[PDB]
């Protein structure tokens, strides 16, 4: 039947990464979540008129299990590489996440998008021009998202699906 896309969210812990998938999968309009629920990470969507199923792996909270990253990553067809716009270290981590994805998938051209996440009102330290320049150097899209208003969230995931479709 319909295509299923296995998407994997990667990025530094402690800076609101989990809000991206929660806001997507959520009852968009009721701020509530039970992650233990069978298929709290599967969502049927219509992208450019084509219905598909998103299966999203977000291991947020398990960042210290660093030797499990390879196995988790290999499950994915496309990757959201997420940093927080008020945490420069999480932005500097992006290069190594991308290198690890390329190694695990054994490909120099893996569908991925760079996501800059605004997780609170603390001052931004990564300007959008810096992140656009990084994404352009990698040949991938850049999407900014809000962890509170849901802005950018659909764009991040739909853009990644388009990268998979056009691979």
């Amino acid at each position: 039947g319909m295509t299923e896309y296995k998407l994997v969210v990667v990025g530094a812990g402690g800076v609101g990464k989990s809000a991206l998938t929660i806001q997507l999968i959520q009852n968009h309009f009721v701020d509530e979540y039970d992650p233990t629920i069978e298929d709290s990470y599967r969502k049927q969507v219509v992208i450019d008129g084509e219905t598909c199923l998103l299966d999203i792996l977000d291991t947020a909270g398990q960042e210290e299990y660093s030797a499990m990253r390879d196995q988790y990553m290999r499950t994915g067809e496309g990757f959201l590489c997420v940093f927080a716009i008020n945490n420069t270290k999480s932005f500097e981590d992006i290069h190594q996440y991308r290198e690890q994805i390329k190694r695990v998938k054994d490909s120099d051209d893996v569908p991925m998008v760079l996501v800059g996440n605004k997780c609170d009102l603390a001052a931004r330290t990564v300007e959008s021009r810096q992140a656009q320049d990084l994404a352009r150097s990698y040949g991938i899209p850049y999407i900014e998202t809000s962890a509170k208003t849901r802005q950018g969230v659909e764009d991040a995931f739909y853009t990644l699906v388009r990268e998979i479709r056009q691979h």
Binding site: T59, A60, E64, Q71
Partner: protein, 469 residues
Amino acid sequence: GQMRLPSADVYRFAEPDSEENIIFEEGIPIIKAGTVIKLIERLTYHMYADPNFVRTFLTTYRSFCKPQELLSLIIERFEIPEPEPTEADRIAIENGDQPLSAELKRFRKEYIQPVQLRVLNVCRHWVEHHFYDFERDAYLLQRMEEFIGTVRGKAMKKWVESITKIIQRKKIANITFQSSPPTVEWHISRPGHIETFDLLTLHPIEIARQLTLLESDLYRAVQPSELVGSVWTKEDKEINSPNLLKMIRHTTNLTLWFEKCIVETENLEERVAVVSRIIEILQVFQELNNFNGVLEVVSAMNSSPVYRLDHTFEQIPSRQKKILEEAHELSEDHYKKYLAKLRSINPPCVPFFGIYLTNILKTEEGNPEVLKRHGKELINFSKRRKVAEITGEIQQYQNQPYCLRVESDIKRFFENLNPMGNSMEKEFTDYLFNKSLEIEPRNPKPLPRFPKKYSYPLKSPGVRPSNPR
């Protein structure tokens, strides 16, 4: 009729329930949201006890009430005014007779004594199971000691004297079994010869047993204080979650050690023996319900340096590939089969902690702290109940001890394992991957040959236990 209550002007916990102060979920009621006053009222309710709620509340309350304020509120709850004499009592006293005091006696028996006892039960659970609040705030402990030590009257006396002693014991602070543990097993390395201990020289059964004891102890040491508030992900994680981090770092180090043992064995035949031995260890982990250990092996076999070693896995016996495949299937589809297996086995077991961490974090990030109703902000207690359901599951598997004997030297060997040495993580994992490329080059580069490195027999003793008299 129901008992009359003190005026809400003199005793705040007698205010009537309303949607402005408490909301229930759709046979005791389950609270969705409420003011802190209403939560404490129901925590210590005169009509029923709610031990689950006591645990849930004491595990999670610091997200909405400070410890000092909680103590003030339960002391306020405890201090219940008694009703005045009724008209019948008045008339008796006016005639020089003793009043029956029926309403007063009922209120003492059915309201004051149950509420006061349930306040003391909160204090008892607080001191016994959440003592870190008092370790971190000596003045809070003084206030609790003073409160308990000045409760008067004989109805509460046994529990007041008991709680006083429990507090004093907690300030300065053994297993029995249905059978004997099995005999410790030895292979090439003999007892006391710690300098020869290694992956292939220790007995694979005993490697799995001693790692299971170690990993069980690490699992059992993690307290809910290290989890609530997602504190293991925050800047002070080393202060707030040290036992959790020690547990995860052990798991990571063992996984990396397995990878290092594999890729530093350059001879193909020897490396097949190494991989085969690690799968045997995985088989014993499965028999012991050590799921952390199972996934340590699975993570190593699916790491980038090991996963690509097609020439090595080609020589692994089919039965061992099947064992590894069925272990890997536990993690597939968001751990569907793992979760079902964990809920089916007979403990003791060692759960994989990572799923709990993700579920606690997402529950706390995905639900609001408060619900706004009728212009009021109510504490969203359903969110805290969901977190405490997870910490309760963790605790349930922390109770059962393994009936296995510690071998102090093997224990020390695995405690001191340090595969990365002084190297940083990226440097080390690049080293492992470059070794993988050296020992099995990318096609179309030819497969080289390498000399043997082990001088002792590679044949496994197997993983079925032996039993001399």
